[PDB]
Amino acid sequence: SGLQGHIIENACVHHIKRRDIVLKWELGEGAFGKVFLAECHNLLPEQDKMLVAVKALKESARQDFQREAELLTMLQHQHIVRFFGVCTEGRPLLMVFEYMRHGDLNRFLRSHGPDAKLGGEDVAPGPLGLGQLLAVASQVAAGMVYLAGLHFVHRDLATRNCLVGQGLVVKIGDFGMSRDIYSTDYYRVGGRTMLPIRWMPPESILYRKFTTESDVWSFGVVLWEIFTYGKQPWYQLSNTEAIDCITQGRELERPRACPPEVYAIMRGCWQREPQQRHSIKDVHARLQALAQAPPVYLDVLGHH
Ligand SMILES: Cc1ccc(NC(=O)c2ccc(C(F)(F)F)cc2F)c(-c2ccc(F)cc2)n1
């Protein structure tokens, strides 16, 4: 449950008046609640009014909301979805986040991939270029560095759990609806429990262990998703065949658009032994340089 997992190991929360939040329309809905585009007044200076994404809590779940909001208030970084605070006067209780114009990273990758149907404000016509793909991956890594820095275990790192804003700014974050919107990205064990198996290392599938290291493995899989324009990992396999391949040491193939150097960052996250796995700091440091490298050096990395 991500935020919940960090709470089960271990207020500065900003409050917003209901009259300062004006609900416009729904963006999505699930089981834990729904998301609305809203207009927020007197939130930030030199703006007066601004657009935000509002999570409306759908029982003794009100206490959960408060600790989640406390955790979200602490979790502030350039590549973590900005949390503005809560509205606790009257029901439904709301969490207020920034509005991310391009939506989740998976949706954005596929819409700028070779399988997209078809204007070009933040990015060029046709599929994303190498430079665009690298900057994307680096921001996700930066965000994961801040999380390993604060010693936070995500448990569900995937491009569907990242968001894209104006000027191609990518941040880790979701509104708790991935299980409803991307149900095929989870394996239903029984009753309620749904696991993102295609993104999980052998110790999370086999031993049910979740760490900072199972999170670097997921990043490796996120790196693969970036270079395949949001394709589902092990798409050719059923849930049981995918569990089998992961537990039997199989590695995901090198994507077409992926340079051997980027594939080496991936393979480093995919070491069977959690200890052997490369730290997120170095995975990020390796990606920052690859992203901020001259086009002369970049063009020699991408062939054909
Ligand atoms: C059922 C479910 C599953 C997963 C969720 N996401 C998280 O726990 C999560 C969100 C954000 C970040 C980061 F890094 F951006 F700070 C890290 C995370 F692990 C949620 C969720 C619950 C409350 C909420 F305000 C937002 C999302 N709910």
From Swiss-Prot:
Entry comment on modification after translation: Ligand-mediated autophosphorylation. Interaction with SQSTM1 is phosphotyrosine-dependent. N-glycosylated. Isoform TrkA-I and isoform TrkA-II are N-glycosylated.
Locus of motif DXXLL: 48-52, 115-118
Effect on the protein upon substituting G28E: In CIPA; following transfection in neuroblastoma cells and NGF treatment, small decrease in the percentage of cells differentiated into neuronal phenotype, but in differentiated cells, the average neurite length is comparable to wild-type; no effect on N-glycosylation, subcellular location, nor on basal and NGF-induced autophosphorylation; loss of NGF-stimulated calcium flux
Entire protein: shown range: 484 to 796 of 796
Name of the featured protein: High affinity nerve growth factor receptor
Outcome (variant: K55N): Loss of kinase activity
Subcellular location: Cell membrane; Early endosome membrane; Late endosome membrane; Recycling endosome membrane
Tissue expression as described in the entry: Isoform TrkA-I is found in most non-neuronal tissues. Isoform TrkA-II is primarily expressed in neuronal cells. TrkA-III is specifically expressed by pluripotent neural stem and neural crest progenitors.
Impact noted for substituting Y297F: Loss of interaction with PLCG1 and altered phosphorylation of PLCG1. Altered neurite outgrowth and altered activation of the MAPK pathway
Consequence the record notes for mutating G85R: In CIPA; loss of function; processed as wild-type but shows significantly diminished autophosphorylation in both neuronal and non-neuronal cells
